[PDB]
């Protein structure tokens, strides 16, 4: 098995944040570590300005900024989840930006349990050493000497095994730690005066105290006050020597504080996060004494309004506050000095997108083009949502547009102050006084004829080529400098002009014209019998309208005749297919090689490769489109010209190096358009629709907020609705019943129902208990409004959900597998597989089928449904009586959480027994264990890649591929599932789904990869695991090794070590998994450096070959 | 709870409970049942049943299921565990010694096995192709333990009834077919001063226990103890923390996967859980509820370092949760004689080989399908797990 893991969307969940002077000593910075990625910003007056983003070779787990003595800008310390410590210094050498590494090296220990409450990394305020609490009972101290280039850490044994949080006290003449440890007597705070000289702890400045039983973190107050702040869940305490004062504010008892950050440099004000998004402020009153230091008076908390579920808080300059989120959007709030409404001081300013915890995902196409769009059940808790992720990039009912063009009546402003909008029988000029839009037809242009072209020629004197007549009119001189009328007086369907030359074709008559201001001469009047529907003249480049070569099409087969200019003789006859005449013929030039697009009426485009050297028609690769006519034209986006096709599926043909991309721009329907880069719509071209006049990253993300956590989703084509499984959380009322915290998408659902099951007629809820209520939402596919909300039974959770046709019933059914869970029970004992049917605006419970155990997963199986009933795989047949019936039971699993199927093979991923492959025997009617993986892996997601390859996803962020050991014997040797793939993805994989976000449309271009499996992770990453061939796998492995030899990581971390299959029990090198990011990075490298990789190996093995391999591979991404 | 932990994982992500596993699986411990097929009787040379003592799993790739076993006549048999056929389990048998075998150890990452015997010698075996590589000699009495460091496959150490501790190196000169001690710790556990169990925490650190002194000692192998000329001084020494005044002795030593914590059965029917990565010499947890009357009783840890299973002289195996010692243990009834050298399978959480004096090596496996469809009476299942009350 050989695969190709690439990242369709980089992770967006925020792990940690820090601020300081990183880029330079003057400009403030904000560093965000979105898992493997690091983002450096500059906090300007208008907000964050992106500067540099680097992909660290590891899961960033510690981020701190320190300023050693003798340094101008602060250094950055990063410690990955695999213990690869490194010190990073920003270095902007000229316009080039790079991050050098001052020190690196592993800090992992062979002996020592990874401590609870995660990795804690602290740096001395004096910036003389670094302390890390990686393991229980140990405290690694890394001296910060300039000569410590390898980060030679030394261990320090300490008595208190269980440490909750470590912090460095400010103002101590020697390095001093302050931590809250736990012993059977209860949580205590004890400080140590660590010394680098003896490499051992000493007695602390102040006596150990007994803190609240749930003290969670330590805040080190700066010099003016000193000491430490110990915030817990109910009380907040301040410890400094003999001074000790505590507060018990009821406003924080509701939920526990998580994040904290210092606001003022003196430490007077502190921010505090929360589970529920609350953003407290911890004020510190200043009590100046007669002669002593400025002691504190008392602590005082305040409520500053609700925000996103905070994972990092970072008080930036002025009053803005960055609030990073792991379960929602990471907004950037502003602390208003005066309360505005509802007692909240925070006003959101710039909400940043975050796909967050993708619980479930499905691939569908709504517009029916074959290009699916991701519909993920993103978010969690109060910030749950439903993102519409799709690849690639003014309705005013009007007749069919016969022509659009920028009428630059401005002298040189290059702004379309007028826009000649033309119909078949009418023509109106759209005057645009800046961003204004009004119709004032100019006196210099007629409207009685359907105009075909109104471009400019020279001396800023425009032309106006109408139907049955041609009338050039100078606009700024306001004089008819040339009124050469059309001698044929026919509809001039073809009117080509560029710079100071115009070559029109009135139906079937080409004329050689030297069209100049006050010079409109009819030198030639050549006329052929064949009609000329489209023709254009374009210069080769900077030349003023000089085109030595020209091409002419035909009618019976549209043979693009190519003639050599020096000879005008036959060199090589060319023939093309297609009987229907093309709608438009366009000469296109994005790269050195030119491409003559042939937009036929059926939508098929034959972009022959035209060459100035030869001009012969190259290979005829066909890009299909809809039956609507396609019109091709050049549009202005950058300094390099580009084209913009128009059809029922508009495509921006943005060609890369030696490759033509046909990405579909997010437009419903376009046939006629004109380029426009005005101030009103800088990025939206003036884009007329089929009958309406409108004006206008690669992974566009829509947001549908739900205000509750979605669990699973599915699509129902028959009903055109979704099947989201959001679960609300409401606090139990003091007088009985439940009261929702906020109005979610479940409450504001038109026509909502309540389940009335009588199966469970056989648990006590306190006033403070928070019971969870699970509903089945039904979301329309177009407006995304909640069409239904079927609340389930009390104390009943919903886990699995599928929509499939069952048995012989033609109706499409909504089947949900629920599970009653009481607080006392460790595992659910009663479940339900309830099947609905969205007939019309309502859900009818057709069947109930009470089961004994949780229904962890469900999926359709050959017209039957099988469910994982709490470590028991049962197969249900849909009887004609509309009742599920048992069949094909299998008691050989332990919490079979995940089921996948393909044909007659079931891949039942277990909880800790790895993947099991089952088989349904039709005539036997019983399940058969074909094969089973044996090494335990703690599965999190499974997928059937092929008939043999079985993808997996360990909860330790590791991917692996099983494969049936065919080369063996049946009796216990063919039952062995042998692992082949091993790969440390670095992200927790939540769901696997087939399909790809890239369109295919029968694009038979010999794709090197087979299949496509998108997966979603907790951090919002979306991958595109594919399958490669043996030769391509070997070539890509060689490329990966060479790139590793050449490319230097930002943290000096070896790629082979980062991608090794890491687990607490084993650590194996990556096998059978080609990294996608590393290979795709080959394109961005400079040519002299790419030559280093290329040299000394295919046969020739030269940079063009490797570049085309990587470019072909990157297309799936 | 188990269900809530699995349910919350997709949203909250990975959270560290403290042990290797990410879920609390203490609810399913009651499903352990040993079928009648796994009742292998280690028959002796004469044909009468013989009590097997000392039986551990292997670690070679693609073979992390073979369970070796030894008895009082020196027979060593390799047992398949995943397969289900009474006569197919014994695919390898031979005479390791003529004077019983007291311990076994599999070479890490390889299919090589070493037996500790009463012949005052330790053989080196190639189980891939039956042969005797060598016979280490130098002990003045019967051996009692053999330990292999998982970080160094070619170095192993033994502790004999005579009382001194010697570490061998297979890479050393073969000489005349007899291996020679590299470092020797003479009189390691002086107050019949037998070294009950030797263990390897790291490539260099070695942990030992005594049958009479009752103090666990930690030795580093970098220094040479052969020329010490006095009683060697251990780098660390975990003193006896119990209350009984009698001269006690430990019977088994076990570490977790990370090598930090240490579990040591003692004669006072307690399993003290020390910590070897800090200054807290005093024990962390006290597991009790069994009868550790005999030195043959040993224990083993779960693969996720979450549960500790130990033998007992009350014909039962006890499984405590490593985080909650106060909770009553899960008792694996089914044996009529004492249970010794229990070995939880490191490569499979389900398999627990409850090794016994009853002349019956039982392999316990999880049975989550308790309801199932047939019952098979009590003939099918010979062992039932039940929480102690």
Curated annotation (Swiss-Prot), chain A:
Modification N-acetylserine, positions: 1
Region (Interaction with CDT1): 1-757
Keywords (A to Z) from UniProt: Acetylation, Biological rhythms, Cytoplasm, Disease variant, DNA damage, DNA repair, DNA-binding, Host-virus interaction, Intellectual disability, Isopeptide bond, Nucleus, Phosphoprotein, Repeat, Ubl conjugation, Ubl conjugation pathway
Region feature WD repeat beta-propeller B, mapped onto this chain: 391-697
Pathway in which the depicted protein is active: Protein modification; protein ubiquitination
GO cellular component, one term: extracellular space
Record PTM text: Phosphorylated by ABL1. Ubiquitinated by CUL4A. Subsequently degraded by ubiquitin-dependent proteolysis.
Positions of post-translational Phosphothreonine modification: 1102
Pfam families, per database record: Beta-prop_RSE1_1st (PF10433), Beta-prop_RSE1_2nd (PF23726), CPSF_A (PF03178)
Region (WD repeat beta-propeller C): 698-1028
Modified residues (N6-acetyllysine): 1052
GO terms under biological process: apoptotic process; biological process involved in interaction with symbiont; cellular response to UV; DNA damage response; DNA repair; ectopic germ cell programmed cell death; epigenetic programming in the zygotic pronuclei; negative regulation of apoptotic process
Sample GO molecular function, one term: ubiquitin ligase complex scaffold activity
Interaction with CDT1 and CUL4A: annotated span: 760-1117
Chain spans, region WD repeat beta-propeller A: 12-355
UniProt crosslink position (Glycyl lysine isopeptide (Lys-Gly) (interchain with G-Cter in SUMO2)): 1098
Location relative to the cell: Cytoplasm; Nucleus
Illness association: White-Kernohan syndrome: An autosomal dominant disorder characterized by global developmental delay, variably impaired intellectual development, hypotonia, and characteristic facial features. Some patients may have genitourinary and skeletal abnormalities.
PANTHER family: DNA REPAIR/RNA PROCESSING CPSF FAMILY
Protein family per UniProt: Belongs to the DDB1 family.
Protein function: Protein, which is both involved in DNA repair and protein ubiquitination, as part of the UV-DDB complex and DCX (DDB1-CUL4-X-box) complexes, respectively. Core component of the UV-DDB complex (UV-damaged DNA-binding protein complex), a complex that recognizes UV-induced DNA damage and recruit proteins of the nucleotide excision repair pathway (the NER pathway) to initiate DNA repair. The UV-DDB complex preferentially binds to cyclobutane pyrimidine dimers (CPD), 6-4 photoproducts (6-4 PP), apurinic sites and short mismatches.
Subunit comment: Component of the UV-DDB complex which includes DDB1 and DDB2; the heterodimer dimerizes to give rise to a heterotetramer when bound to damaged DNA. The UV-DDB complex interacts with monoubiquitinated histone H2A and binds to XPC via the DDB2 subunit. Component of numerous DCX (DDB1-CUL4-X-box) E3 ubiquitin-protein ligase complexes which consist of a core of DDB1, CUL4A or CUL4B and RBX1. DDB1 may recruit specific substrate targeting subunits to the DCX complex. (Microbial infection) Interacts with Simian virus 5 protein V.
Domain notes: The core of the protein consists of three WD40 beta-propeller domains.
Name assigned to this protein: DNA damage-binding protein 1
Species in which this protein is naturally found: Homo sapiens (Human)
Curated annotation (Swiss-Prot), chain B:
Post-translational modification: Ubiquitinated by the anaphase promoting complex/cyclosome (APC/C). Autoubiquitinated through 'Lys-48'-polyubiquitin chains in a PCNA-independent reaction, allowing proteasomal turnover. Polyubiquitinated by SCF(FBXO11) when not phosphorylated, leading to its degradation. A tight regulation of the polyubiquitination by SCF(FBXO11) is involved in the control of different processes such as TGF-beta signaling, cell cycle progression and exit.
Gene that produces this protein: DTL
Annotated positions of the Phosphoserine modification: 386
Induction of the gene: Induced by TGF-beta, the up-regulation is immediate and transient.
CC per GO annotation: centrosome; chromosome; Cul4-RING E3 ubiquitin ligase complex; Cul4A-RING E3 ubiquitin ligase complex; Cul4B-RING E3 ubiquitin ligase complex; cytosol; nuclear membrane; nucleolus
Identification of the protein by name: Denticleless protein homolog
Swiss-Prot/TrEMBL keywords: Acetylation, Biological rhythms, Chromosome, Cytoplasm, Cytoskeleton, DNA damage, DNA replication, Membrane, Nucleus, Phosphoprotein, Repeat, Ubl conjugation, Ubl conjugation pathway, WD repeat
Similarity remark: Belongs to the WD repeat cdt2 family.
Protein's membrane topology: Peripheral membrane protein
Tissue specificity of this protein: Expressed in placenta and testis, very low expression seen in skeletal muscle. Detected in all hematopoietic tissues examined, with highest expression in thymus and bone marrow. A low level detected in the spleen and lymph node, and barely detectable level in the peripheral leukocytes. RA treatment down-regulated the expression in NT2 cell.
GO molecular function terms noted in the UniProt entry: protein-macromolecule adaptor activity
Cleavable signal peptide: none
Keyword Transmembrane helix in annotation: no
Complex and partners: Component of the DCX(DTL) E3 ubiquitin ligase complex (also called CRL4(CDT2)), at least composed of CUL4 (CUL4A or CUL4B), DDB1, DTL/CDT2 and RBX1. Interacts with CDKN1A. Interacts with DDB1. Interacts with FBXO11; SCF(FBXWO11) controls DTL stability but DCX(DTL) does not control FBXO11 stability. Interacts with CRY1.
N-acetylmethionine found at: 1
Functional summary from the UniProt entry: Substrate-specific adapter of a DCX (DDB1-CUL4-X-box) E3 ubiquitin-protein ligase complex required for cell cycle control, DNA damage response and translesion DNA synthesis. The DCX(DTL) complex, also named CRL4(CDT2) complex, mediates the polyubiquitination and subsequent degradation of CDT1, CDKN1A/p21(CIP1), FBH1, KMT5A and SDE2. CDT1 degradation in response to DNA damage is necessary to ensure proper cell cycle regulation of DNA replication. CDKN1A/p21(CIP1) degradation during S phase or following UV irradiation is essential to control replication licensing.
Motif (DDB1-binding motif): 168-171, 219-222
């Amino acid at each position: 098995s050989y695969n190709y893991v690439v990242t369709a969307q980089k992770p967006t969940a925020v792990n940690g944040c820090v601020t300081g002077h990183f880029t330079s000593a003057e400009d403030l910075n904000l560093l965000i570590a979105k898992n493997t990625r690091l983002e450096i910003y500059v906090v300007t007056a208008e907000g964050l300005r992106p500067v540099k983003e680097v992909g660290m070779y590891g899961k960033i787990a510690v981020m701190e900024l320190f300023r050693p003595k003798g340094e101008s800008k602060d250094l950055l310390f990063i410690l990955t989840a695999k213990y690869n410590a490194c010190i990073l210094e920003y270095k902007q050498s000229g316009e080039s930006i790079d991050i050098i590494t001052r020190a690196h090296g592993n800090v992992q220990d062979r002996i020592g349990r990874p401590s609870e409450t995660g990795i804690i990394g602290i740096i001395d305020p004096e910036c003389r050493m670094i302390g890390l609490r990686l393991y229980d009972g140990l405290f690694k101290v890394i001296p910060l000497d300039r000569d410590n280039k390898e980060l030679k850490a030394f261990n320090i044994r300490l008595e208190e095994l269980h440490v909750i949080d470590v912090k460095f006290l400010y103002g101590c003449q020697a390095p001093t730690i302050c931590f809250v440890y736990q012993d059977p007597q209860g949580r205590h705070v004890k400080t140590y005066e660590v010394s680098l000289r003896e490499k051992e702890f000493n007695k602390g400045p102040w006596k150990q105290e007994n803190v609240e039983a749930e003290a969670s973190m330590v805040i080190a107050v700066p010099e003016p006050f000193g000491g430490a702040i110990i915030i817990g869940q109910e009380s907040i305490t301040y410890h400094n020597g003999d001074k000790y004062l505590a507060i018990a504010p009821p406003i924080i008892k509701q939920s526990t504080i998580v994040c904290h950050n210092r606001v003022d440099p003196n430490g007077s004000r502190y921010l505090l996060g929360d589970m529920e998004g609350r953003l407290f402020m911890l004020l510190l009153e200043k009590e100046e004494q007669m002669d002593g230091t400025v002691t504190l008076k008392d602590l005082r908390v305040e409520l500053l309004g609700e925000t996103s579920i905070a994972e990092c808080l970072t008080y930036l300059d002025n009053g803005v506050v960055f609030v990073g989120s792991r379960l929602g959007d990471s907004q950037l709030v502003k602390l208003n000095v005066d309360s505005n409404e509802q007692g909240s001081y925070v006003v959101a300013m710039e909400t940043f997108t975050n796909l967050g915890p993708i619980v479930d995902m499905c691939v569908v196409d709504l517009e029916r083009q074959g290009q699916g769009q991701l519909v993920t059940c993103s978010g969690a808790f109060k910030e749950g949502s439903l993102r519409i992720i799709r690849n690639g990039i003014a309705s005013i009912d009007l007749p069919g547009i016969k022509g659009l063009w920028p009428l630059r009546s401005d002298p040189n402003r290059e702004t379309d102050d007028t826009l000649v909008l033309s119909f078949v029988g009418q023509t109106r000029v759209l005057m645009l006084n800046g961003e204004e839009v009004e119709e004032t037809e100019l006196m210099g242009f007629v409207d009685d004829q359907q105009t075909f072209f109104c471009g400019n020629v020279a001396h800023q004197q425009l032309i106006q080529i109408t139907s049955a007549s041609v009338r050039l009119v100078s606009q700024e001189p306001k004089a008819l400098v040339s009124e050469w009328k059309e001698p044929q007086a026919k509809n001039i369907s073809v009117a080509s002009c560029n710079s100071s030359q115009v070559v029109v074709a009135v139906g079937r008559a080409l004329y050689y014209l030297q069209i100049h201001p006050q010079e409109l001469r009819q030198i030639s009047h050549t006329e052929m019998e064949h009609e000329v529907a489209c023709l254009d003249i374009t210069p080769l480049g900077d030349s003023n309208g000089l085109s030595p070569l020209c091409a002419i099409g035909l009618w019976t087969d549209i043979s693009a005749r190519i003639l050599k200019l020096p000879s005008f003789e036959l060199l090589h006859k060319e023939m093309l297919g297609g009987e229907i005449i093309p709608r438009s013929i366009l000469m296109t030039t994005f790269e050195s090689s030119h491409y003559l697009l042939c937009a036929l009426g059926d939508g098929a485009l034959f972009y022959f490769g035209l060459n100035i050297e030869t001009g012969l028609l190259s290979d005829r690769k066909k890009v299909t489109l809809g039956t609507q006519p396609t019109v091709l034209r050049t549009f202005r986006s950058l300094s390099t010209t580009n084209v913009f096709a128009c059809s029922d599926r508009p495509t921006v043909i943005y060609s890369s190096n030696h490759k033509l991309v046909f990405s579909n721009v997010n437009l419903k329907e376009v046939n006629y358009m004109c380029p426009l880069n005005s101030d009103g719509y800088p990025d939206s071209l003036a884009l007329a629709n089929n009958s309406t006049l409108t004006i206008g990253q690669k992974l566009h993300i829509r947001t549908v907020p739900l205000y509750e956590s979605p669990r699973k989703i599915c699509y129902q084509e028959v009903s055109q609705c979704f099947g989201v499984l959001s679960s609300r959380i409401e606090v139990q009322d003091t007088s009985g019943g439940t009261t929702a915290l906020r109005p979610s998408a479940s409450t504001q659902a038109l026509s909502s129902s309540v389940s009335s099951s009588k199966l469970f007629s056989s648990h006590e809820t306190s006033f403070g208990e928070e019971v969870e209520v699970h509903n089945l939402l039904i979301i329309d596919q177009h407006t995304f409004e909640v069409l239904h909300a079927h609340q389930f039974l009390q104390n009943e959770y919903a886990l699995s959900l599928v929509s499939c046709k069952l048995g012989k019933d033609p109706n499409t059914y909504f089947i949900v597998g629920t599970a009653m869970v009481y607080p006392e029970e460790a595992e659910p004992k009663q479940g339900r597989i309830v099947v609905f049917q969205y007939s019309d605006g309502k859900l009818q419970t057709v069947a109930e089928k009470e089961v004994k155990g949780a229904v962890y997963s469900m999926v359709e199986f050959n017209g039957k449904l099988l469910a994982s009933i709490n470590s028991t795989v049962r197969l249900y047949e849909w009887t004609t009586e509309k009742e599920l019936r048992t069949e094909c039971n299998h008691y050989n699993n332990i919490m079979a959480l995940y089921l996948k199927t393909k044909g007659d093979f079931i891949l039942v991923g277990d909880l800790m027994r790895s993947v099991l492959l089952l088989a349904y025997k039709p005539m036997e009617g019983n399940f058969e264990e074909i094969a089973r993986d044996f090494n335990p892996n703690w599965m999190s997601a499974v997928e059937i890649l092929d008939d043999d390859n079985f993808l997996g996803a360990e909860n330790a962020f590791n991917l692996f591929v099983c494969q049936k050991d065919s080369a063996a014997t049946t009796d216990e040797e063919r039952q062995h599932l042998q692992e082949v793939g091993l790969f440390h993805l670095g992200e927790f994989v939540n769901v696997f789904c087939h399909g790809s976000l890239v369109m295919q449309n029968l694009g038979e271009t010999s794709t090197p990869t087979q299949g496509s499996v998108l997966f979603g992770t907790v951090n919002g990453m979306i991958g595109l695991v594919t399958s490669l061939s043996e030769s391509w796998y070997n070539l890509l492995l060689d490329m990966q090794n060479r790139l590793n030899k050449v490319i230097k990581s930002v943290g000096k971390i070896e790629h082979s070590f980062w991608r090794s299959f890491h687990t607490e029990r084993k650590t194996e090198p990556a096998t059978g998994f080609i990294d996608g990011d590393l290979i795709e990075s080959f394109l961005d490298i400079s040519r002299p450096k790419m030559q280093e990789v290329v040299a000394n190996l295919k046969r020739e093995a030269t940079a063009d070959d490797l570049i085309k391999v990587v470019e072909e591979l990157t297309r799936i991404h | 709870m188990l269900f809530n932990s699995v349910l919350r994982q997709p949203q909250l992500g990975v959270l560290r409970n403290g042990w290797s596993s990410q879920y609390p699986l203490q609810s399913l411990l009651t499903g352990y049942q040993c079928s009648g097929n796994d009742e292998h009787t280690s028959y002796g040379e004469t044909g009468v049943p013989v009590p097997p003592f000392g039986c551990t799993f292997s670690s070679a790739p693609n073979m992390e299921h073979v369970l070796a076993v030894a008895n009082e006549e020196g027979f060593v048999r390799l047992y398949n565990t995943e397969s289900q056929s009474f006569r197919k389990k014994c695919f390898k048998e031979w005479m390791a010694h003529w004077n019983a075998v007291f311990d076994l150890a599999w070479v890490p990452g390889e299919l090589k096995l070493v037996t500790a015997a009463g012949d005052q010698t330790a053989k080196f075996w190639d189980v891939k192709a039956g042969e005797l590589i060598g016979t280490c000699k130098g002990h003045q009495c019967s051996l009692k333990s053999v330990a292999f460091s998982k970080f160094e496959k070619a170095v192993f150490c033994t502790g004999g009834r005579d009382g001194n501790i010697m570490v061998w190196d297979t890479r050393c000169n073969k000489k005349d077919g007899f291996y020679r001690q590299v470092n020797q710790i003479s009189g390691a556990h002086n107050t019949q001063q037998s070294v009950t169990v030797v263990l390897f925490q790291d490539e260099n650190t070695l942990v030992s226990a005594g049958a009479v002194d009752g103090i666990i000692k930690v030795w580093d192998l970098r220094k040479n103890y052969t020329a010490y000329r006095q009683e060697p001084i251990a780098s660390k020494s975990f003193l006896y923390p119990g209350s009984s005044t009698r001269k006690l002795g430990y019977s088994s030593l076990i570490l977790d996967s990370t090598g930090s914590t240490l579990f040591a059965n003692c004669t006072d029917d307690n399993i003290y859980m020390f910590n070897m990565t800090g200054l807290k010499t005093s024990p962390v947890a006290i597991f009790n509820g069994h009868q550790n009357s005999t030195f043959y009783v040993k224990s083993s840890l779960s693969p996720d370092d979450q549960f500790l299973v130990s033998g007992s002289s009350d014909e039962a195996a006890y499984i405590w949760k490593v985080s909650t010692p106060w909770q009553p243990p899960t008792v694996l009834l089914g044996h009529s004689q004492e249970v010794t050298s229990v070995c939880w399978c490191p490569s499979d959480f389900t398999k627990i080989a409850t090794c016994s004096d009853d002349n019956t090596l039982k392999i316990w496996r999880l049975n989550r399908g308790l309801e199932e469809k047939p019952g098979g009476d009590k003939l099918s299942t010979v062992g039932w797990a039940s929480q102690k009350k």
